[PDB]
């Protein structure tokens, strides 16, 4: 497996190698290879069901395959069929995967939980719903023993002990060691998860007759060694404090025949473990570092129980995107009770009514049309066929996500239109070799933010097109309702207004929040048009929540470095919260070290709460305006979040 963005689709094109398709062709080939390819494809599907959906290519080995005649041939878990959409190109099978929709409670998509469990007679793996319930419940035999201590066991002595919740008979295979190592994780996991029961290797399970193995190949020493190894190597988890170890006991019940010993019956007694025990790491995957990565048992078990954090501590908050109706990688979104919900923000920033085609930014489309001549003609030409939708403009859409603005890009237009794929229009003053690259990367990052961060469950593709002002998805991906583009815009409001809140990242895992109208206004303002601004006093964290994003914008637009964005803030909690952040935004230095040091290379400066600047320290405004105006490249930006 790998991850390829080189494909025309602006998505996560997992290259799953070459498969051999066709049901009959599946039946008439190597079953080992069939299972290998099926497992690889399901690996890729489980990877894309978490990461945010994408594509799976496959170089078909079958010459003359046809998706209408020969079928597919893939054996797929039943829950992994509501998401896959298959397709064929002349020599490439494609499988388009949407998100996971956190359907039926389970947060992430799992192939198999590998949390075995023993029912009345059989050891079955807990499905994802059972495993989630089982973790949620652990977080919040005298007769078989008498048999266990028995010394003499004669051949074919029919045991009075029947298979039950606490016993299990497993006959010996050809290789006793290989078979016991293959079966021990299973039964040990089963017993530890359940009330805890014994297991006897070497005795038939239905007739319950002592058989054992021949002594010529078995060695009790190496057997016990391998058993304790493969029993302590089991990936376990622990919701408790002591963190004990798997407390088992092993015994070799003797085996006699006509008064002559001929083998043993490996009797293993596993006690009820206080925490979950796996047979190996869960078979769940994701796409990380642009490759496939198996979620670690600790992260798997802390993700399956990543319930929406209890907002009972702060009864003033209100939840708006629960993780029970979102994607795997989404986070909840709480808003103050008085601040507007997600629905009002959607209907205010991106209205939807089918009588015409409107523009989300009236002032951005207007100023762009009053400045550039011909932009109005190009937009009215491209926007002519579509009758219902909304065209949204942004001085450069790559910046509103977090990417890096390019040179020679007039503006970016996204059109949300029902009954057709949403279309991204990127308008260039001049054609070059970066048109396609920039458009595809902006569209790909936009879809990723809409799915992962925004939490869009249904199918979503953003079609990128470039126009110099001077592929094909299946029918499923084409919108079909006016009640799903409403979901797309309720997710876009989150993508363009969501920030990782600081108030509640102590209240749980992590909880996003929504900027007000004034903060998004002051953020959307063009920097290359306004390199100097004095902001009215912002109540509460106004300036901080805004500055932490204005600095990312400053780094992206001006191609500046984090080391050239000075952040002059006084309060020490602000200093630690901004500096010790993992993203390395700026250099928070107080007013004292501001005027007690020389900044030779600082280009952009953002000041916080100039109301506390003492005059005896020095006339800060002159020095600041000097160091910005005389910056290395051009007049630097100067934002003073005074009150
Ligand atoms: Zn424990």
Numbering used by the authors: 3 to 142, 169 to 498, 512 to 684
From the paper:
The full-length SLFN5 protein was vitrified in the absence of nucleotides. A 3.5 Å cryo-EM density was calculated, giving insights into the overall domain arrangement. The data was acquired in the absence of nucleotides, suggesting that the missing density of the second ATPase lobe could be due to relative flexibility between the lobes. In addition, the loop connecting the Slfn core to the linker domain (residues 335–366) holds the two domains together.
The Schlafen family belongs to the interferon-stimulated genes and its members are involved in cell cycle regulation, T cell quiescence, inhibition of viral replication, DNA-repair and tRNA processing.
